[PDB]
Amino acid sequence: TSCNPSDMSHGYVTVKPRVRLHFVELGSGPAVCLCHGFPESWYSWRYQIPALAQAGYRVLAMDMKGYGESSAPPEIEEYCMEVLCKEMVTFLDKLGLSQAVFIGHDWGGMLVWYMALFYPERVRAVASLNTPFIPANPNMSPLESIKANPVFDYQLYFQEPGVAEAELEQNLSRTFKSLFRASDESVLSMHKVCEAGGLFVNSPEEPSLSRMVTEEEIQFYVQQFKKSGFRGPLNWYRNMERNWKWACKSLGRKILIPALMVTAEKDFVLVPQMSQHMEDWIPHLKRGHIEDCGHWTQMDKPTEVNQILIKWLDSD
Amino acid sequence: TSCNPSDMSHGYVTVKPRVRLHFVELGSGPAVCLCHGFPESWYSWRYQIPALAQAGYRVLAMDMKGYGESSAPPEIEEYCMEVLCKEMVTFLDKLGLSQAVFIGHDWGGMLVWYMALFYPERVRAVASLNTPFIPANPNMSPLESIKANPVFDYQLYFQEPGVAEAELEQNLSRTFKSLFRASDESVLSMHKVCEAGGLFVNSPEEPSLSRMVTEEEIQFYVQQFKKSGFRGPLNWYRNMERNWKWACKSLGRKILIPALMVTAEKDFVLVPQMSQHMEDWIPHLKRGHIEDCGHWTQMDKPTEVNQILIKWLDSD
Ligand SMILES: O=C(N[C@H]1C[C@@H]1c1ccccc1)N1CCC(Oc2ccccc2)CC1
Numbered sequence: 125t126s127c128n129p130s131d132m133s134h135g136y137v138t139v140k141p142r143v144r145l146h147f148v149e150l151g152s153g154p155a156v157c158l159c160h161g162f163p164e165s166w167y168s169w170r171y172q173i174p175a176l177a178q179a180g181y182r183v184l185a186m187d188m189k190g191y192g193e194s195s196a197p198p199e200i201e202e203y204c205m206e207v208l209c210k211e212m213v214t215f216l217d218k219l220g221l222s223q224a225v226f227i228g229h230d231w232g233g234m235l236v237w238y239m240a241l242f243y244p245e246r247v248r249a250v251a252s253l254n255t256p257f258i259p260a261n262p263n264m265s266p267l268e269s270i271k272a273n274p275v276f277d278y279q280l281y282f283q284e285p286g287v288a289e290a291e292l293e294q295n296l297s298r299t300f301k302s303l304f305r306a307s308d309e310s311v312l313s314m315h316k317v318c319e320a321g322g323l324f325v326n327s328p329e330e331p332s333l334s335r336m337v338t339e340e341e342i343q344f345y346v347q348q349f350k351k352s353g354f355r356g357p358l359n360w361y362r363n364m365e366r367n368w369k370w371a372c373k374s375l376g377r378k379i380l381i382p383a384l385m386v387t388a389e390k391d392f393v394l395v396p397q398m399s400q401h402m403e404d405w406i407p408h409l410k411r412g413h414i415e416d417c418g419h420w421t422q423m424d425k426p427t428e429v430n431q432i433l434i435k436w437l438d439s440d
Numbered sequence: 441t442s443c444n445p446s447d448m449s450h451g452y453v454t455v456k457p458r459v460r461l462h463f464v465e466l467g468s469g470p471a472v473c474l475c476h477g478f479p480e481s482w483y484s485w486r487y488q489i490p491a492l493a494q495a496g497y498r499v500l501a502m503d504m505k506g507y508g509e510s511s512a513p514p515e516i517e518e519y520c521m522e523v524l525c526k527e528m529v530t531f532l533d534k535l536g537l538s539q540a541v542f543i544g545h546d547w548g549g550m551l552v553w554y555m556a557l558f559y560p561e562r563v564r565a566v567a568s569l570n571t572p573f574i575p576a577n578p579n580m581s582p583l584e585s586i587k588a589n590p591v592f593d594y595q596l597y598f599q600e601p602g603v604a605e606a607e608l609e610q611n612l613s614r615t616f617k618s619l620f621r622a623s624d625e626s627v628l629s630m631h632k633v634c635e636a637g638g639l640f641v642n643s644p645e646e647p648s649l650s651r652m653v654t655e656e657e658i659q660f661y662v663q664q665f666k667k668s669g670f671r672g673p674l675n676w677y678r679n680m681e682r683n684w685k686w687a688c689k690s691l692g693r694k695i696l697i698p699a700l701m702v703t704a705e706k707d708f709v710l711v712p713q714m715s716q717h718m719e720d721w722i723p724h725l726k727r728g729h730i731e732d733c734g735h736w737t738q739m740d741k742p743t744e745v746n747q748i749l750i751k752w753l754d755s756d
C-alpha cells in the first residue's frame with residue numbers, strides 16, 4: 125500500500141537555468157501528475173502512487189518548487205502562480221508529454237486549477253482535493269478577504285519573511301507531529317496566531333504521534349525539510365496580490381475539460397461549502413466527498429481517496 | 441534533430457545497494473528501452489529518441505552499467521550477462537513496468553537478445569542493431585572461437601585489466617575521434633592489436649573530425665568517460681566463459697515474441713552474414729538492412745534507422 129523512497133524511480137527536469145523539479149515515477153499508461161500542498165512532499169502521495177500505477181496509470185509525483193529535491197530559490201516572486209504554472213508546462217515539454225491529468229491537494233490544488241484555466245491544452249483532466257476553484261473578484265483585493273474571514277490569521281503570520289520560518293524550522297519533528305494530525309487530534313488554533321506570537325506558542329512541546337502517521341514517516345519529512353527549509357514553501361503564501369492580478373486576466377473563460385472536486389468533511393481551512401457554487405462555472409464537474417476526513421486527506425483516508433480517483437480516471 | 445542533455449528528463453533507479461542505473465526519458469505511450477554498446481552512451485541514441493517519442497512511444501535511453509551517470513563497480517563479475525539482465529529486470533520492476541520493447545546495439549544488442557531468451561515475460565518485442573542472435577554452442581570454448589577469427593584479436597587485448605583502460609583513457613578526445621568514424625574514414629585496423637601493443641599504435645596523433653560528428657558531440661563523450669573511465673565498459677568483454685555457461689542453460693528455448701534484426705553493410709566486426717541463419721531459430725523474424733553503414737549505425741544512418749524502427753514498432 126505504500127512507497128519506499130529508495131525503491132522509486134527518481135526523475136529530474138531542469139525547467140530553467142536556476143531550477144530543477146524532482147519527481148518520482150511509477151507505472152505505464154496515461155500520465156497523471158500529482159501536486160502536493162503545504163508543507164508536504166511527493167511522499168504525501170505514498171498511498172496513491174502504487175494504487176494509481178496498479179490501476180493502469182503512469183504516475184508522476186512531484187516535489188513542488190520549494191520542496192525536497194526540487195530547487196528552492198529564495199525570491200518570493202519565484203513562487204507566484206504564473207511562474208509556477210509556466211514551469212510545470214515546461215516540465216511536460218522536457219518530458220515530451222503533450223498532456224497530463226493533473227491532481228492536486230491544497231496549494232497544489234490551486235496550482236492545478238490555474239493549469240486547467242490557462243493551459244487547458246496541456247491538461248487532459250483536472251482533480252482537486254479540498255481546494256475549490258473560485259473565479260477571481262476584480263473588485264475586492266486579497267487583503268479584504270482575510271478581514272472577511274478571521275480563520276486566515278495564520279496567513280498574515282506567514283507574510284513577513286524570516287518570522288514563520290524560524291518557528292517551523294526550530295524543531296522539525298515537533299512541527300510535523302503538530303501539523304499532521306486527524307482533525308479530532310488537533311493541537312493547534314489557526315485563529316489568533318499573530319497576537320499569540322506563533323503557531324506553536326502554547327501547543328505541546330512533545331506532541332504525541334497521530335494515528336495517521338508513524339515515527340518513520342515523520343522522520344522522512346524531517347529529513348526532506350533539512351535540505352531547503354521553510355522559506356520556499358512559505359513563499360507560496362506571499363504572492364496574493366500577484367496571483368489576484370494574474371487570475372483577473374482570464375475572467376471570461378471557463379474550464380471545459382473533465383474536472384473533479386473532492387471535499388473533506390473536517391478540513392477546517394478548506395471547508396467543503398467553499399466549493400458549493402463551482403457548478404456555476406463547471407456544470408460537468410464531478411464530485412466526491414469524504415466523511416470523517418481532515419485536512420491531510422491522502423494520509424487520513426487513503427482508501428477513500430484511491431477509490432474516488434480511480435473511478436473518476438477510468439470514466440471521464 | 442538531436443537531444444540537448446540539459447533539456448532531457450533524467451531518471452535514476454537504484455537496482456541494488458551499490459548500483460543505480462541512469463536513463464533519459466522522452467514521450468508517452470508504450471515503453472521502449474534503448475541499450476547502447478561499447479564504448480557509447482545513452483547519447484548515441486540522440487537521433488532516435490525524439491523520432492520514437494514523436495512516433496508515439498515512451499523512450500527510456502539507458503546509460504548501461506559501467507557508463508556515464510550509471511554506477512560502475514570495479515569487479516569484472518558485475519558485468520556478466522546474468523547480472524546485467526537481472527538488473528534490467530529490477531529496473532523495470534521499480535519503474536512499475538510489466539513489459540518493455542527492448543532495442544539494443546552492439547553489446548546492448550547481445551543484452552536484449554538474452555533478455556528475450558531468459559525474461560520473455562518482461563520483453564514485449566526485441567530489436568537488435570548489428571548484433572546477431574547465435575544460440576550457444578555447447579562444444580566450443582569462448583577462447584576457442586577467436587582462434588578461427590583474427591579480426592577479434594582486439595578482444596584478447598581487452599582481457600588483461602588496466603592495459604586497454606590506460607590506452608583508451610590517456611587521451612579521451614583522440615579515442616573517440618579515432619573510433620567514431622564512417623567505415624570509409626577508418627584510421628584503425630583490428631588485425632594484430634596484441635603484438636602491435638595497443639589499439640592506437642599506428643593511427644594518427646590528432647585525428648580529423650569524422651563527418652558523422654561535431655566537436656561538441658565528441659566532447660560530450662569525453663565528459664562522460666571522465667567520471668568512470670573504461671574499466672566498467674571493458675569488463676563487458678571479460679566474462680566470455682561465464683556468459684557462455686549461462687547461455688548453455690537456454691538451448692531449448694526459442695524467441696517467440698516479435699523480433700527485428702538490422703544489419704549494417706560496412707560494419708566490419710558485426711558483419712551482416714553473421715546473422716544469415718537467424719530465421720532457423722526465429723521464423724517470424726523481421727529484418728532491416730542499411731547500405732553504406734558502418735558500425736556506428738545510429739549516428740551513421742539515423743534517418744534509415746528511424747524509418748526502420750518506427751515501421752516495425754507500428755507493425756509488431
Ligand atoms: O493555508 C492553506 N493550507 C493550510 C493547511 C495549511 C497549513 C496551515 C497552517 C499551518 C500549516 C499548514 N491554504 C490556504 C491558501 C490556499 O487556499 C485558498 C486560497 C485562495 C482561495 C481559496 C483557497 C491553499 C490552502
Ligand SMILES: O=C(N[C@H]1C[C@@H]1c1ccccc1)N1CCC(Oc2ccccc2)CC1
Nearest residue numbers: 478479546547550571574594619709710735
Ligand atoms: O567488440 C565488439 N564490438 C566492437 C565494435 C566495438 C569496438 C571494437 C574496437 C574498439 C572499440 C569498439 N563486440 C564484441 C562482443 C559481441 O560480438 C560477438 C561475440 C560473440 C558472438 C557474437 C557477437 C558484440 C561486438
